[PDB]
Amino acid sequence: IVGGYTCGANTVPYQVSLNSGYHFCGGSLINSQWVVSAAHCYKSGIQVRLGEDNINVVEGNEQFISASKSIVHPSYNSNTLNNDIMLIKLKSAASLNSRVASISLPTSCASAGTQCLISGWGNTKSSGTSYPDVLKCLKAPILSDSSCKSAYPGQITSNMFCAGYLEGGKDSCQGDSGGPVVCSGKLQGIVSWGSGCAQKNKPGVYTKVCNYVSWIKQTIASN
Ligand SMILES: [Ca+2]
Fold it and tell me: Which H/E stretch holds residue 215?
């Protein structure tokens, strides 16, 4: 997160870190046994880390649970990042409490102008590289479809939306991928892609979760 703020420990209780020996992506807890993340974050050997603030220090509210299965969206295209969504099942159910909690799925899509909370442990610099140890947060609005498509000609599908600031300086970044965009208590987006980070006229591009609720629910029901 570039241009954000320190969230505060366990203030974002659905935020997870995906770990394969090291943090590599975020995710969102959607029930006691399932996480949603970005398909471009796929790899084998994932451990899900819940209840984290400092990802380098054990602070006392963590739960570390191995994934048993990952399911990339059946239409994911890694060239275009269309359908950049994946589900991860935990080997055992997490213990839900005030610091480890699920986030609701949308019953309706959000609109341009809605303010949302984006979070992660990704890079905090718009040029060069600095990785935080504690969770960072950014409040940002959803941008119009027309401004999103104008920013990224030929690249925005119906499964993507843009959020952030066209002036630059505030955005998600590398290492935030797969993490949440929450608006009015609903998971509306997944951190997906963008040109660099926090660049002028290059806002963040997010997977549009409301298009996937049927697939998520059916998949969970049968796995
Ligand atoms: Ca920790």
Answer: helix 213-221
